[PDB]
Amino acid sequence: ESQPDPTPDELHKSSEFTGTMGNMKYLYDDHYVSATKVMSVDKFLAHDLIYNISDKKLKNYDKVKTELLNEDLAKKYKDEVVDVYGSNYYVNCYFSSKDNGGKTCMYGGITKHEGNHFDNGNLQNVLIRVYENKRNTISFEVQTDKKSVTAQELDIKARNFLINKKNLYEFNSSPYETGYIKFIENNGNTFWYDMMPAPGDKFDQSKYLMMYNDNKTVDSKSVKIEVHLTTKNG
Ligand SMILES: [Zn+2]
């Protein structure tokens, strides 16, 4: 059923990462694609959808391609009016079938608009508990207007806060050696994401963000979230 917690040896270690941690920071530091009530207009590969979404803030794009885990998911949302929220990238973002106004790429992040908001139009607060070397040091809330929200949206908001509050990611490296965010649903199901880059000297943004392609959603009103960091080295 649910995924078992991380084994000690499998968590990515920042000490084994030789690239620029700033490239991971970029993906979560006040960085995200957002849109409401849109419908896809085109496709590239069988598992993706293309939307006309403009970079409101910093005019960097007018088109967005989101890749999904499979062809079924893409077909399911193809003609639906949806809301979008996710972390985008530009390096190795591929479009056109020889040819096929900037463009940007991302994974998952879509939810149906209809019936997915709160009656009183208020926002739902989600508590995030932070653990450092097995100690709950701080806890804070992030918000969403969606009853059923993607795990990606909640993750992004949580890391954005920790970047500023705890300097989660810096340009050169990170004060933490290990890190993973865990979700606990009200039906008992659990799952987690590794918050550190794979070992080596070159961070692959596209490959990392791919973990969101399942378009996983959770009930904002009842889900629990825990961030587990260690400085177990230094
Ligand atoms: Zn909506």
From Swiss-Prot:
Entry's localization field: Secreted
Annotated phenotype, changing residue 113 to A: Complete loss of emetic activity
Keyword Metal-binding attached: yes
Binding residues annotated for Zn(2+) 1, in chain numbering: 9, 83, 113, 117
InterPro entries assigned: Enterotoxin, Staph/Strept_toxin_CS, Staph_tox_OB, SuperAg_toxin_C, Superantigen_bac, Toxin_b-grasp_Staph/Strep, Toxin_bac
Cofactor note: Possesses two zinc-binding sites. The zinc ion is necessary for the toxin interaction with MHC class II.
Positions that bind Zn(2+) 2: 47, 71, 80, 114
Residue pairs linked by disulfide bridges in the UniProt entry: 93-105
GO CC list: extracellular region
Keywords, comma-separated and alphabetical: Disulfide bond, Enterotoxin, Metal-binding, Secreted, Signal, Superantigen, Toxin, Virulence, Zinc
Superkingdom of source: Bacteria
Gene Ontology molecular function, alphabetical: metal ion binding; toxin activity
The protein's required cofactors: Zn(2+)
Major location category of this protein: secreted
Entry similarity comment: Belongs to the staphylococcal/streptococcal toxin family.
Protein function: Staphylococcal enterotoxin that activates the host immune system by binding as unprocessed molecules to major histocompatibility (MHC) complex class II and T-cell receptor (TCR) molecules. In turn, this ternary complex activates a large number of T-lymphocytes initiating a systemic release of pro-inflammatory cytokines. Also causes the intoxication staphylococcal food poisoning syndrome.
Assembly notes: Interacts with host MHC class II molecules composed of alpha/HLA-DRA and beta/HLA-DRB1 chains.
The protein, known as: Enterotoxin type C-2
Species whose genome carries this gene: Staphylococcus aureus
